[PDB]
Amino acid sequence: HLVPRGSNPPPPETSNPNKPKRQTNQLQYLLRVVLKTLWKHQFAWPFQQPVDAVKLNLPDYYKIIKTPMDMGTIKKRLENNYYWNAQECIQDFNTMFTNCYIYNKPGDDIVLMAEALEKLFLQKINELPTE
Numbered sequence: 001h002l003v004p005r006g007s008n009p010p011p012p013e014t015s016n017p018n019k020p021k022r023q024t025n026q027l028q029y030l031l032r033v034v035l036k037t038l039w040k041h042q043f044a045w046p047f048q049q050p051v052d053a054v055k056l057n058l059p060d061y062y063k064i065i066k067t068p069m070d071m072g073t074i075k076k077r078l079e080n081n082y083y084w085n086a087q088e089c090i091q092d093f094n095t096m097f098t099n100c101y102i103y104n105k106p107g108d109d110i111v112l113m114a115e116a117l118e119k120l121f122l123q124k125i126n127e128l129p130t131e
């Protein structure tokens, strides 16, 4: 009962080599504190790279989720100074959580994992430094 699975999209872009560099205290906090905390969490592992929805057989994932996002992407974006400001990075974290909550049933393990990361995220974002 084989069906066409299609392809995963290319991973989100993580490099903008000709963007001028600008560090901000908020971007520094996101990289060195927020991302580090979530990355090392026991439930981070499914979120550390783009979801392979094809190989995991997640039906209709790319029809439902218009903007895939993951912490591996966010990490590389931060490291490469891809983000112009901290709100762009926070938007990506939110997109990652939103996608998981939209696609999956509320009881599911992956949702519980995302919720644990989001609770920690919001704790750290509460102490985001002023601009």
Ligand SMILES: CCCCS(=O)(=O)Nc1ccc2c3c(cccc13)C(=O)N2CC
Pocket: 046, 047, 051, 056, 058, 099, 100, 103, 104, 109, 110, 113
């Ligand atoms: C419950 C932990 C399952 C981790 S997994 O590697 O076996 N499968 C999944 C990885 C990433 C995602 C999902 C999702 C739904 C169902 C299974 C999995 C999903 O939304 N993601 C992206 C976080």
